[PDB]
Symmetry: D2
Subunit: 251 residues, 4 copies
């Protein structure tokens, strides 16, 4: 308990599923949290469901929106004081092979999944370096950052990019003594309402040729590894990849 | 707090350095612990330094000793009840290139670092499967399981072996619904009394071309990732590698 | 000899350095080659230096230019018949950390290094599937696709993207029986006239803490692995990463 | 043609399947070859099938036999002159999970697959260093060196060991300017008479959930990457992993 004492976290895509579980456990461990999402309806309800505005607030933002990133860091500092912790969790999927990806689909997915993580990482380093915060940037980088999927071409590109860009940022922050760590988290298949809304999706993901455990994960599985990485417990972990996938990548 | 409620852990090489830190944090999180080591003098003192014999005990054992593994699981069950958690941390180093490794050095190091982890993993699966324990085997597998070191040839062999053997065991346990997870932890350079006893060793390990953070870790850095992996917080993590190395492998 | 009998290859950035060496060895092994580059002065001289217009031609192209990719495949087919082989070699570097990367630098580098490899791979699959050509797409994906560099943030993002996007494409082509393979090549540091023009670059690259061989490579080092991947010798290799780096990533 | 001009190669387990194909292509490319195997009936027939005793000979040897390794290098030097090239191909498999592996099975498999590769690599470095031979050690390290298989526990241990031990040897040889390269080759599933003798093996290996190409490879698939690694074409490749697996590890 109090594993995130004094921390101030931004969690992009924090209004549902994995992001909301990360936000929930972060508040339970003593962090102040600003969650982001595209929809005020979802986001204001989500913040209130977790805690008071002294614990957690919502900021409406598309991660692809560069100017919005400045507003987001300014709003979080105004509410909670200097930001110590950034979880770049916002992402979209296109269910196309490379061959069948349109240029419009390619640009839209990279704008959220890659540009957004770049904008957040770049700004996070500038705003959180050299303040003795034990600062931590956690980039969501998928099992699709390790292995290909024939029907997730653009998503694979974005997650590979996040995986190695995060190492670059980890190294620069370490070498310059910035007191900022950067790591990637790689979820396998996770049961969310969105999976539950697609008939047969969980059953397909639970086949042993996909997930050896024969079931898929829950959002708290990703929340717990994020608490470790945001905490000072992980002060020697930087430039690392943390996989939580039911054995998906082990075979 | 109470993150290892009800757990019963064996930690090999648990009498000093990283193993002792893992044992200390495991007891602090509510686990019963049996630590092993070659020397009764070190081991009985270490157990008493951490807690009462109702919390932690010592069992004298060389991990290379196959028959001793049976005695160790029997003694732990007699003291604390069924074992839920095994940390295979016992290991030795030979400071020779492959070229300059004698056959006697090769066999001695593999007996501890590889045979020992095999004997512990094999027995752990048999003893901890199908009991609803949330069982977890944590194999120590080094940054030397990912990258070569020209003067650690046999050690590199042993750590590569542990890395991939652990995936095999993770997959079999997952596919057979055994309720046993197997993961590897990969420390970079860690400050211990043994490092402190070698003049200039910490300074060499802290050079940026080795450890980008410009310093080395402390035993608690490895203890915290082991608490996560032993706990039910990591119930969807199996067959994964967890690196805590100050950026060593990121460059 | 004749290891690329009947092959028709496009090599982007084929007018200089690594691309020119690949083109030279491809023509030697019996391939017909279209090389691309931004500058017709360089490109027309380069094609004539290697062979006759029945062996090798130049097509002026920026790999970021989507419409130009269509014209490039059309021109290659007109000159040499159906394309069997694509080497996505064109690339640029920005020598900035993630922190210091401007948005204009980010967008410019991703346009060439990521968008261009996507446009080439997508069009390559569409044009070379189901023609019994033994088709092969070779993506240049850098050692910077495996490890971070603190001063190559955008470059690392682009090379990690190419690494995993290529696996996606490899799998879709294999599962659909397209007779198209996709693989990545990961050069370490290679001596080119351009490296010769950067004072101290080769010397810095040649430090044992960077390249263990204590020297950097030459363009033919990359040409020879590309001949293997373009040829039918590699008909069971798809979704693989081929590193030629002097030991850079082994430590 | 003549890609292995002047080379003198030892190929362990060179009398059947993959080893025999490597030997066949090595002789075709101008190498002198000593093949090893346990059975003189098979070995003498295999050598005569490929070439004359001035091109290729057989030496009876179990790779687990340390004293026999000395006699093998002595016999090869006597027949062909100084050895330039070693392919550590000899291997055995036990079809047991870690849980089900007997100690006798463990020790027997490690004696061949790990001890034998150590004995060969160590002796190879000692005999081929500092002779200007362009020396090359190629270690067979399996897709089972990258991913687990629930029913290949000891095999996975041995192949992970070879993978990382080879990086250690590569680095020491590079740093000491020995003119010795060390690399690993990782075959996927390969059709051999031995696979043909296991009912349903090829069919199981050919499922898209195992090999995405929907078929397995042939021995020449491994021979061609070994020619590249033995030749001076690969003079900048050391400490690298070369996977030829039909897409097995890409998903
Ligand atoms: Cl040009
Ligand atoms: Cl034989
Ligand atoms: Mg490195
Ligand atoms: Mg896989």
């Amino acid at each position: 308990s109090n594993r995130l004492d004094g921390k101030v976290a931004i969690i992009t895509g924090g209004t549902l599923g994995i992001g909301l579980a990360i936000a929930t456990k972060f508040v339970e461990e003593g962090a102040k949290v600003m969650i982001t999402g595209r929809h005020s309806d979802v986001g204001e309800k989500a913040a209130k469901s977790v805690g008071t505005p002294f614990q957690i607030q919502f900021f409406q933002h598309d991660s692809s929106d560069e100017d919005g990133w400045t507003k987001l860091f300014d709003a979080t500092e105004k509410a909670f004081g200097p930001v110590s912790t950034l979880v770049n969790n916002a992402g979209i999927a296109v269910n196309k092979s490379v061959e069948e990806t349109t240029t419009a689909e390619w640009r839209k997915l990279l704008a959220v999944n890659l540009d957004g993580v770049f904008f957040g990482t770049r700004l996070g380093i500038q705003r959180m370096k050299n303040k003795g915060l034990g600062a931590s940037i956690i980039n969501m980088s998928s099992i699709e950052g390790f292995v290909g999927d024939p029907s997730l071409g653009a998503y694979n590109a974005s997650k590979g990019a996040v995986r190695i860009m995060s190492k670059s940022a980890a190294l620069d922050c370490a070498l310059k003594d910035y007191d900022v760590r950067v790591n990637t988290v790689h979820p396998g298949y996770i049961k969310t309402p969105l999976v539950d809304d697609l008939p047969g999706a969980e059953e397909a993901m639970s086949q042993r040729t996909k997930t050896p455990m024969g079931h898929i994960g829950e959002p708290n599985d990703i929340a717990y590894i994020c608490v470790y990485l945001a905490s000072n417990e992980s002060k020697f972990a930087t430039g690392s990849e943390f996989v939580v996938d039911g054995g998906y990548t082990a075979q």
